């Protein structure tokens, strides 16, 4: 741990997702889109 | 999902309660208790 190839210290993180141990509460985002009106469109409002 | 509905108002008469809050806890619940 002295300032300085297999001896090199490196910062490591592990991502383990406990998603099915309970109901989910953290999500990825969902990009929206500007709305148009008075035209036949395929709408998706909140699902 | 723990759901809480309420309404406060100035017992005979009819009143409908609005929802307030839902909590995604996933808890096994059996008992409740007051805090006076």
UniProtKB/Swiss-Prot annotation, chain A:
Residues 21-43 are annotated as: Disordered. Changing residue 21 to P: Increased resistance to human covalescent sera neutralization. It comes from the Viruses. Attaches the virion to the cell membrane by interacting with host receptor, initiating the infection. The major receptor is host ACE2. When S2/S2' has been cleaved, binding to the receptor triggers direct fusion at the cell membrane. When S2/S2' has not been cleaved, binding to the receptor results in internalization of the virus by endocytosis using host TFRC and GRM2 and leading to fusion of the virion membrane with the host endosomal membrane. Alternatively, may use NRP1/NRP2 and integrin as entry receptors. Binds to host ACE2. RBD also interacts with the N-linked glycan on 'Asn-90' of ACE2. Cleavage of S generates a polybasic C-terminal sequence on S1 that binds to host Neuropilin-1 (NRP1) and Neuropilin-2 (NRP2) receptors. Interacts with host integrin alpha-5/beta-1 (ITGA5:ITGB1) and with ACE2 in complex with integrin alpha-5/beta-1 (ITGA5:ITGB1). May interact via cytoplasmic c-terminus with M protein. May interact (via N-terminus) with host bilirubin and biliverdin, thereby preventing antibody binding to the SARS-CoV-2 spike NTD via an allosteric mechanism. This is Spike protein S1. It comes from Severe acute respiratory syndrome coronavirus 2. The gene is S. The chain holds residues 497 to 545 of 1273 of the full protein.
């Amino acid at each position: 741990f002295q300032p300085t190839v297999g001896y090199q210290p490196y910062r490591v993180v592990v991502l383990s997702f406990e998603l099915l141990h309970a109901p989910a509460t953290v999500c990825g985002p969902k990009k929206s889109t500007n709305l148009v009106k008075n035209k036949c469109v395929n709408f998706n409002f909140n699902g | 999902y723990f759901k809480i509905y309420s309404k406060h108002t100035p017992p005979q008469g009819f009143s409908a309660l609005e929802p307030l809050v839902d909590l995604p806890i996933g808890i096994n619940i059996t008992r409740f208790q007051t805090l006076l």
